[PDB]
């Protein structure tokens, strides 16, 4: 926001608590993972974008309050966070791209916020050499500057400040004769000056993500950093919420109804399964099973639910206990957790246990095939043009985003008002809305 625009150059020499080290990353990602969403559901020139964007930039504490020369709260957060999250995103050339992609969509926003003035000071100072020209040289050479410029309409050489740079640094533009040159100097505005920044910024960033890997072997050894290197997007969410405990009061004969208006695609499929087929595969008794406690089911009820829903499947009332009661009692209760009490995260249901013929678990938007999905979504009665968006997404791989797009439509609104990342959550919002 302020002298908050910074070329993540020159490494932090400080040191932190594994508590700050770990929180800077989870957070620094949450941001970068929100820069990703907004760029997917909106455009780079909208208020909603600019707004929410700086809104999170805000909530994650990455542009705000000052202090005595050294310790500038947000300044710091962003500096470390970035570098630390250079470790994680240095590996896969598919992450290196994605990182650069979203850490450059970020410098862009922190530039779209500063007035033609503050951005100026930042340059003079920044790297090293750049100069502005007085209105004397400015208008004296005005006409010639507008002649060298693009299809730039009119003869208007606006108030828009103009800079003087070494012809060599503006190669990208003088090669096409897109700026005025004089005794070895180019004259360009802000738009283009910026793009050159962003340009040299990517190239340098990539360069680094390169030298980050090379020397990665000297730490993978450390035990505290496995959860970062390996798991910043595994089963464990950007920072999930809905865990255990929590409250709620659900009657039973209502689930059916809620199935239409509350659960998301995933669970919607499963209930029908369990109601139609009177049973559910292993993979399934768990996705839904959990999720049900998370919405608040009770030990008593859970058993009730399944039991009576397994007896319509003409089973032995006694065989349930002997075979299912056990697992179900565990779920709710005690230890041996992390996969028996942790209602599935979305990123989870999306990357583990895909489903096979007979299985109705997993994420539709991800796992069901285009056409079938198409056939499914129409039963939910989603505008054929609407369905047109969703699948456009599914083609991008922004799977839950789509779920989002679905939330909105079944609920009637222009913006759900949050970034989804877990079934129950999607369950609750659907309840706040009632």
């Amino acid at each position: 926001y302020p002298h908050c625009l910074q070329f993540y150059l020159q490494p932090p020499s400080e040191n932190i608590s594994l508590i700050e080290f770990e929180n800077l990353a989870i957070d620094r990602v949450k941001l970068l993972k929100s820069v990703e969403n907004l760029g997917v559901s909106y455009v780079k020139g909208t208020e909603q974008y600019q707004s929410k964007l700086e809104s999170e930039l805000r909530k994650l504490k990455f542009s705000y309050r000052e202090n005595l020369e050294d310790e500038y709260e947000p300044r710091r957060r962003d500096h470390i966070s970035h570098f630390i999250l250079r470790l994680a995103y240095c590996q896969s050339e598919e992450l290196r791209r994605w990182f650069i992609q979203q850490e450059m969509d970020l410098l862009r926003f922190r530039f779209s916020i500063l007035p033609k003035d503050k951005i100026q000071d930042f340059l003079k100072d920044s790297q090293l050499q750049f100069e502005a020209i007085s209105d004397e040289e400015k208008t004296l050479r005005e006409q010639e500057i507008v002649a060298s410029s693009p299809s730039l309409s009119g003869l208007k050489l606006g108030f828009e400040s103009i800079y003087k740079i070494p012809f060599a640094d503006a190669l990208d533009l003088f090669r096409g004769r897109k700026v005025y040159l004089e005794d070895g100097f180019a004259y360009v505005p802000l738009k283009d000056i910026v793009a050159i920044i962003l340009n040299e910024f990517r190239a340098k960033l990539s360069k680094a993500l390169a030298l980050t890997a090379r020397s990665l072997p000297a730490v993978q050894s450390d035990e505290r950093l496995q959860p970062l290197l390996n798991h910043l997007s595994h089963s464990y969410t950007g920072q999930d919420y809905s865990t255990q405990g929590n409250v709620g009061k659900i009657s039973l004969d209502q689930i059916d109804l809620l199935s239409t208006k509350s659960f998301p695609p995933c669970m919607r499929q499963l209930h029908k399964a369990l109601r139609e087929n009177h049973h559910l595969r292993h993979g399934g008794r768990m996705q839904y099973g959990l999720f049900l406690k998370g919405i608040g089911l009770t030990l008593e009820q859970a058993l009730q639910f399944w039991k009576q829903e397994f007896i319509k499947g003409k089973m032995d009332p006694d065989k349930f206990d002997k075979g299912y009661s056990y697992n179900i009692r565990h779920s709710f209760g005690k230890e041996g957790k992390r996969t028996d009490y942790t209602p599935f995260s979305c990123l989870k249901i999306i990357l583990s246990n895909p489903p096979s013929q007979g299985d109705y678990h997993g994420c539709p938007f991800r796992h069901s095939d285009p056409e079938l999905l198409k056939q499914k979504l129409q039963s939910y009665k989603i505008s054929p043009g609407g369905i047109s968006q969703i699948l456009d997404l599914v083609k991008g791989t922004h799977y839950q985003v789509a779920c989002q797009k679905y939330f909105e439509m079944i609920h009637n609104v222009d913006d759900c008002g949050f970034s989804l990342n877990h079934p129950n959550q999607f369950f609750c919002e659907s309840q706040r809305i009632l």
């Binding site: 490494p11 932090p12 020499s13 400080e14 040191n15 932190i16 608590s17 594994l18 508590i19 080290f21 770990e22 929180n23 989870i26 470390i80 570098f83 590996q91 896969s92 050339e93 598919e94 730490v219 035990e223 505290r224 959860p227 089963s235 464990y236 920072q239 865990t243 405990g245 595969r281 292993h282 768990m286 002997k322 075979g323 056990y326 697992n327 565990h330 005690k334 230890e335 041996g336 957790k337 992390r338 996969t339 028996d340 583990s352 246990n353 895909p354 096979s356 013929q357």
Partner: protein, 488 residues
């Protein structure tokens, strides 16, 4: 090769690089083809697919093939197998069913295992019985569901019978081959066989010596002694009257161990799960387990400190034990700062009053835990081994210390550093009022009590129980993450 006549470490790393590189590149690709990559290693890649149609799998393998070989010029991936069942235990260690195609659609199921050897020959029959029994259903072709359900089934009974006595007395006879004469065995008291052997010799005729195999079971003496010291001979068992079989032991220390090593990997089954299947042993059983084992899978507080020990302190006046697991006690309205009233109803003392003793005991409870972590207790990972030794071998594996009993299992710290770092952080948060409040919603529920109980003094009082720990984690247990070192 370090000692080659044609060495040049660079040339190598470079290669190794491209290597690990060209691997991910590939791994991504597969996922990019919406196909789950269940494993990899230097140049290999296992890939769960979900087809029943092998005619489709190769057509698929090759599809992969192409794409991958299409990209490079020389290097090339190659089809290399198919398993019709797989139990991925851990690194380079799996059980599975290999396919050998006969003609046009049919094939063959060859049993191929490795890294699944049990060394100790002292597992009772009921164990090995129950053991294999599963391993089989596991290499059965039936469904995950089908396998496991039966496994639950069977096991469930095992237990039952075990309790009604339907199991042959011998089925419990364990057997070890002494390699020292009874009075030469250090661990004495704690080794079951050497115990019986000892009883025997000093008691009657025939005397046991080197190379001889001994027989024993575990019973209920009413001596409460350690299990180890409750080893008797089959004979002296049936012919004696006052003693009885110790169902507990086997069920827990015999059967489960095995089955376990084999089921832990199974999604949906877990340590405890089995254990309950075998009896009303939950609690204590989970105790038997770990804190660590789960370190394959950021968290919340309630669960981040679940395994840590609650701080305790008896009231300097009434004496009753006080248990402090957090800044507050209760919920909503009647939420009092745990440090307000003595759990003893008839006591009228304010523990806050005794801020010294508290700051003391803690100190003491924290030496305790720093000592433990420091004791060094290393323990074998293989359930069938579990060698508990304070001696760190100079014989290291890739993972770490090389178990010296079974020469194929690594020792893993009994009380991890992380296990500690979390017991101190737990003490720290049990007295960080500062944060236990900014944890409240409305600035009103906040003030209400901020003004009802947290007077600057009380706040200080807490800042003290809190400065207790702080100091500890200060320069200690590298809460410090020298970034300079990490990038310099």
């Amino acid at each position: 090769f370090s000692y080659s006549r044609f060495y040049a470490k660079p040339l190598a790393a470079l290669v190794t690089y491209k290597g690990r590189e060209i691997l991910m590149h590939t791994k991504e690709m597969v996922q990019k083809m919406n196909l789950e990559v269940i494993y990899g290693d230097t140049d290999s890649i296992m890939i769960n697919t979900n087809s029943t149609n092998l005619e489709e799998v190769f057509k698929l393998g090759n599809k992969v093939k192409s794409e991958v070989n299409k990209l490079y010029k020389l290097l090339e991936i190659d089809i290399d197998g198919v398993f019709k069942s797989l139990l991925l235990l851990k690194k380079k260690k799996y059980a599975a069913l290999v396919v050998e195609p006969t003609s046009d659609g049919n094939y063959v199921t060859k049993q191929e295992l490795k890294g699944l050897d049990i060394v100790r020959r002292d597992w009772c029959d009921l164990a090995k019985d129950t053991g294999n029994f599963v391993i089989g259903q596991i290499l059965s072709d039936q469904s995950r569901d089908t396998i496991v359900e039966n496994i639950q089934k069977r096991l469930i009974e095992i237990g039952e019978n075990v309790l009604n006595g339907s199991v042959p007395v011998s089925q419990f006879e364990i057997n070890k081959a002494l390699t020292k004469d009874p009075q030469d065995y250090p661990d004495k008291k704690s080794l079951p066989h050497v115990h019986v052997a000892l009883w025997i010799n000093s008691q009657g005729g025939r005397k046991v010596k080197a190379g001889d195999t001994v027989s024993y079971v575990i019973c209920q003496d009413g001596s409460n002694l350690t299990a180890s010291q409750r080893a008797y001979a089959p004979e002296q068992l049936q012919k004696q009257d006052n003693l009885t079989i110790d169902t507990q032991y086997y069920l827990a220390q015999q059967i489960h161990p095995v089955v376990a090593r084999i089921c832990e990997p199974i999604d949906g089954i877990d340590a405890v799960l089995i254990a309950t299947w075998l009896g009303l042993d939950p609690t204590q059983f989970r105790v038997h387990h770990y804190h660590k084992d789960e370190e394959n899978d950021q968290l919340t507080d309630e669960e981040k400190y679940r395994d840590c020990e609650r701080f305790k302190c008896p009231c300097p006046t009434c004496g009753t034990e006080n248990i402090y697991d957090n800044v507050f006690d209760g919920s909503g309205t009647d939420m009092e700062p745990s440090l307000y009233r003595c759990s003893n109803i008839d006591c009228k003392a304010s523990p806050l009053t005794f801020t010294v003793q508290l700051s003391n005991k803690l100190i003491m409870d924290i030496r305790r835990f720093i000592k433990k972590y420091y004791d060094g207790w290393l323990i074998c990972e293989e359930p069938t081994c579990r060698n508990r030794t304070r001696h760190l071998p100079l014989q290291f594996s890739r993972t770490g210390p090389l178990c010296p009993a079974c020469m194929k299992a690594t020792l893993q710290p009994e009380y991890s550093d992380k296990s500690l770092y979390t017991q101190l952080c737990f003490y720290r948060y049990i007295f960080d009022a500062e944060c236990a409040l900014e944890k409240l919603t409305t600035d009103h529920e906040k003030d209400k009590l901020k003004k009802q109980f947290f007077t600057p003094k009380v706040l200080q009082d807490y800042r003290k129980l809190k400065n207790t720990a702080e100091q500890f984690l200060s320069r200690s247990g590298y809460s410090e993450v020298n970034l300079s070192k990490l990038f310099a």
